[model samples]
Target: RDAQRMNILAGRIIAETVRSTLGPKGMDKMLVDDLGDVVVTNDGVTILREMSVEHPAAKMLIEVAKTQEKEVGDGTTTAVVVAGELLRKAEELLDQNVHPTIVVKGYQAAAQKAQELLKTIACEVGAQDKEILTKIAMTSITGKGAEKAKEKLAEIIVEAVSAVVDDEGKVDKDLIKIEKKSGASIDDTELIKGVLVDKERVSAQMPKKVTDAKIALLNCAIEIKETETDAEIRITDPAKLMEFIEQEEKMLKDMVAEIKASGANVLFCQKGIDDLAQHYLAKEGIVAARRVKKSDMEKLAKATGANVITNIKDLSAQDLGDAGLVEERKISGDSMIFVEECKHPKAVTMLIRGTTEHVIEEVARAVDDAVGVVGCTIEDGRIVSGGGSTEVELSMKLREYAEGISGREQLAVRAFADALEVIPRTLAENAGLDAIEILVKVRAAHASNGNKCAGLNVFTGAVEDMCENGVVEPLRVKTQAIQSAAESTEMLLRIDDVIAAEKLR
Candidate 1:
């Protein structure tokens, strides 16, 4: 009996930790763990990823946000809190002697019910609906430190997602890199139509920018090859040594000649670049960046329709990619060279900049959510109203479902309906408004007027129709959030005991 409450409490604590960050006016956390970059930002998954804890139940529930992140991209925070509320409801039902099995069946049924209800509520959207996509992006970007600059970031995010979104509505978000650098407003951020190889020009002597660049993405070496056999050459004559070295230079220059034979004005090598080779390429006015990451190389190929050549000797003009401009730009100590303006970029890059380190990281996270959600709607083909709008509708409909169920299972269904209110409730309360007042008004609209979009408006502290107010989220976001919450809480309800054990890694 004590074990049930213990695990439930463990899960609740984990949920409430990030629940405090809900809504347009909720708090953003300075996540406590010491890591590479402190995520002082909006993502529930981001905060939980940095969280270090010893409680087994707490750690187990951490997977809730992970499920949310991968399935829907955003709303991980809401999923965690929803799990907490479900467990909160669990503890209540357990006290009343309602069997765990009953509540488990009821909550799982409610999740399935919510899925059907979501399909009914889902308003179909598409690539042609750019305005709604922007609205969706804006809503996701709101409430964080970046909210003030949300609209612009939303526009940029839409463009990026649009670029990567295929005619089949598939968007592989990894194709759009979020390149972060300190020292510009979020407004200064721009989207590049091709890969931004986050590396510097191989030599200072190379042109910083190349217009109408024909790019060679090389898997082969540009440097001089070392001898494999055991051999030695002595400087028997100083002039003879000079000639031998010149011959070595000639061989490298011939490699450059091979690159020149192809009409490539830019070179990105996956292997090393010799100093003399860099100088030769630079003197030819060709831009060059060495040691490009394999991931970037793949992205370059996708965006520019170029083939990755393993041999410089095989380098052909046909293999070169066409770009409007290839430029190396300054940002902090290291640099980023952009290959922009691909004709039909299958991949793209978002260059995000901010005034300081913290702001940059925060903005990057916000833009990430925007991109995630934008792609969700674009590909999934539908979205739903947010800001408590969807939750209230879900709750009210589940209440109708509960009344229809005849068994004791209806009690669990009622609890599940009650549990869904945490979002609207938390949003209103955290924003310093009376949560019950907003909930009652929204319920009145949903029940009496049949207004599905009615939800708490944190900005005005009133119950407004969030769908009209541009508060929208992808349809998958709500379904995944609710489904994951119920599943986690179901597992939490099943576990009856925990014993401290040793780590044997």
Candidate 2:
């Protein structure tokens, strides 16, 4: 079959889905399933990831967005929206008598510009005082924070973001934690205060709230590590049977001490804790919650400020919390806590408030995206700073990298580098900003700094340097919004072209 209008139409449709949510005017999407279950969200990943795509070329867009999501947790929307827009522009060019190849070239060129624009918008977080970090949080809380809550939460979220950030901010997700509460929409809610969970201890053996409660994070379940197997321990002699029981007892004692050493006053285990193990811990005056799910464990770990302990014999005052647990109607109240304030080098969650459930989710999603986006954008790529300031450096490196290639595939590699700027330019256009102005400044900066092929390292200091010179500021307010939109666009643009597997008899 020859290429036809179907591909173009498919691209256009995908673009529309994302464009509808563009900018502050962007609205929420309500997805309803056949079972009558409905989900209302503005999160790009949730929207795109949940939808089904049927087009092959459109699938490409979705895959790209997926990469962005997994890597940065944000920017998928921006990438997708830009790609869709490019397709729209490409289609227009095709209609105007431009060959597909030429249209593709133009689109590719535009993509490069867009990437340049992205650099301008991103701010580096090398220092704790980097005011740009607040911008990142505010951007994420867009339509999710109130006037007062926005500023306060932005401050908290920025600190939280910075706390979990690695050398380049692409650290573990556990570092930047999140919690949910029930009261109002996320928009109207104030800043999140405490850790939230959906759990109910089966035993209710302890108080729902424990002030000055100490907690321990157990990597292993509070139960006995080894269960009594059905396999008959056929001991032909009484002495052998006695040895087996002694060994089991010793093992149980050792496990109990290990738990105590981990500094846990309350032990929450994910796997099944044997009755023997439970008895052992209870005897030691330790509270144990067993059979927890990985998800709940993770949430509890973040909420309680407890270090997941492998052993219990080394329990200390530092390992316990002033806070224990709370009772909430929707959460089933199984989720327990230990401390009020966790004092450790690990990641901590910032409870963000909202007026509605969806609003809270969106704010949480946005914060997550910000952390991920900054990490991927800053560390993985060649370092550049100062908005479009590093475009020239990046272009030079792209040219050099492309030159090192000996085959036609080099064409694609070179195109990838050249296309990085497509993000920044497209972002400018979408934001009604001056792309050319930014582009020109970037080029000039590169020449002045003797940056030839500097794009290889432009990701590090070049763009940010521009901020110091008062020439540019790679603000991070759009990390969540842009990324979310990109993801949605890609998901909606998926192509469907499956061949039936039947024999022509």
Q: For each candidate, what TM-score against the reference?
A: 0.82, 0.52
C-alpha positional error of residue 27 in candidate 1 after TM-score superposition, expressed in Å: 6.1
lDDT of 2 by residue, 1-505 (tens): 4244566567667656765453343466565777775776656767777775666556655666665545445445555655555444434434555444533443344344445555642334455554544554455555453465666666665555555556544577653446665445444333333454434443544444544545555555443235677654454686676668888788779867765665445556666777766567656666666666677555555545545545455456665433444323332322435233434334464655556676667667666655654554345332234344344454554565456646543444354345446545643554555667666655654664554322211223223344343232233323333434333433333323544657622
Please give the distance, in angstroms, between residue 505's alpha carbon in candidate 1 and its true position after superposition. Answer: 9.5
**Top-scoring candidate (lDDT):** 1
**TM match of model 2 to true structure:** 0.52
Supply every candidate's count of residue pairs whose N, Cα or C atoms clash at under 3 angstroms. 0, 103
TM-score of 1: 0.82
lDDT of 1 by residue, 99-121 (tens): 77776787777788788876887
lDDT of 1 at 100: 71
* Candidate 2 residue runs with Cα over 4 Å from true position: 1-3, 24-58, 75-78, 81-126, 145-148, 167-169, 176-178, 183-286, 292-344, 352-363, 374-505
